[PDB]
Design a protein around this ligand. Sequence first.
Ligand SMILES: N[C@@H](CCC(=O)N[C@@H](CS)C(=O)NCC(=O)O)C(=O)O
Ligand SMILES: N[C@@H](CCC(=O)N[C@@H](CS)C(=O)NCC(=O)O)C(=O)O
Ligand SMILES: [Ca+2]
Ligand SMILES: [Fe+3]
Ligand SMILES: [Fe+3]
Lengths: 241, 241
Amino acid sequence: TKQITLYTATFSPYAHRVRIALEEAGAEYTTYDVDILRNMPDWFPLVNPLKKIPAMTFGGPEVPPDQPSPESAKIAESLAMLEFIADLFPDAKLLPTDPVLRARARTFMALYENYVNGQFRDVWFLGTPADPLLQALEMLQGALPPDGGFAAGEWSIADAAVIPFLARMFPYLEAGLGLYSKEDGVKMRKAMASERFARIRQYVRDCRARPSFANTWAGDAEQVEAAKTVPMLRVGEHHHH
Amino acid sequence: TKQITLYTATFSPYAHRVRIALEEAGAEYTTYDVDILRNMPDWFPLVNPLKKIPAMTFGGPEVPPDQPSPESAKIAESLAMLEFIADLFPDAKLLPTDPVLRARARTFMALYENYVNGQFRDVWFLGTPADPLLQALEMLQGALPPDGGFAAGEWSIADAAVIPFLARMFPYLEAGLGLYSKEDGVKMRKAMASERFARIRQYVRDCRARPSFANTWAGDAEQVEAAKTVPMLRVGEHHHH
Ligand SMILES: N[C@@H](CCC(=O)N[C@@H](CS)C(=O)NCC(=O)O)C(=O)O
Ligand SMILES: N[C@@H](CCC(=O)N[C@@H](CS)C(=O)NCC(=O)O)C(=O)O
Ligand SMILES: [Ca+2]
Ligand SMILES: [Fe+3]
Ligand SMILES: [Fe+3]
């Protein structure tokens, strides 16, 4: 019954993670947009001293999100929020019950966070070479069950962790967003359409088809427009190797 | 009943995490050292295709660790292993039961992984300036309960995740091991002895005092000798300015 407020931003894949999990949980929750990269409100460090989105408050009196209460628990870091939502809503089965299948979910989240996420960041924001990102995506694809299904078989928070980033990749590439070279843009678009990546394309389709994605996605073109507000995505700048 | 085998290396803080959790769980398990950085056995990709330590096998027939069975589950990534051990040994209370306290543990692990570990890597492997690492350590220290205790209050896997790295910092600095300059080494040693970092010193003491640390630590001098075998620590080498 305790209130949940998620501070969010449309462009943010980290915040998208948590919206997906809250949808899958059937939770009652409030979202509040924060212009974190261009105009952070003076009160925002009260809900997250790290000054990052997402931020979550839990419990305390019901208050407007721009008047946060000292009495609410302040939860930081998207993957911590994913596990928190799974803990709060056990009947929603946001993780498997079998320990080995649960470990597949945790391993998948760690493979993404430790080896793929930084490659997405460095290719898009710094224009580093795309081959290491493609190699990391092929590795992550190899962790998926071959015949279909989600990271741990049944849908779990591991898939909430990963789909926000994979789903942005395709329309960002088509719109030319990112500081990578033309050559690497072509390389990535060809690779992600090639037979090499058939499995991860099916994974993306399967994740996007769920109501939790549809109800937390602004649409491809709208998400592209939101990403254009990110200052680090300096239009007209490209890096070459 | 199902066997646990942890592939290990004395120098490795990631492997150390899992040894600590297994000790706290009261698990029966085998450890098997792998010279992963200098002489990886040809069979090791069968237990971890990423070619990283730690690796874990679970279940399957009892076999010599250098003859791994296809029937065992292959678990990768140290933090996934920590959550796995918590799942396997619920009576050991390796996480709190309260959702908010559990989220404190998950947040603390994410703070370390996302903001602290990479600063340790920059300073120790590249010799970049120490101030950003000291700032990240002060942030992590600020997430501890100021009056005492572990990251989530009671001891949890969050403390298994973090103590291997903090516990290596002090003896490595005393040995001058790492690519930072003598000047930054003195700066870090002075800072870590100052009142600024009294709370994290108490944390390191409290974690080290537990049998799970004593039984998984070779001793300060011995751990330093094992770290000198790590190629990227480049023993005898330092970068300046
Ligand atoms: N590790 C965080 C990453 C969050 C993150 O970096 N969020 C961005 C927006 S997509 C942000 O708030 N950036 C602001 C900053 O770093 O100052 C998580 O998993 O929640
Ligand atoms: N994300 C991994 C990191 C493991 C790791 O990097 N292990 C090192 C030893 S400290 C290793 O095996 N390095 C060999 C390599 O990267 O190729 C985990 O949490 O287990
Ligand atoms: Ca596979
Ligand atoms: Fe972002
Ligand atoms: Fe290492």
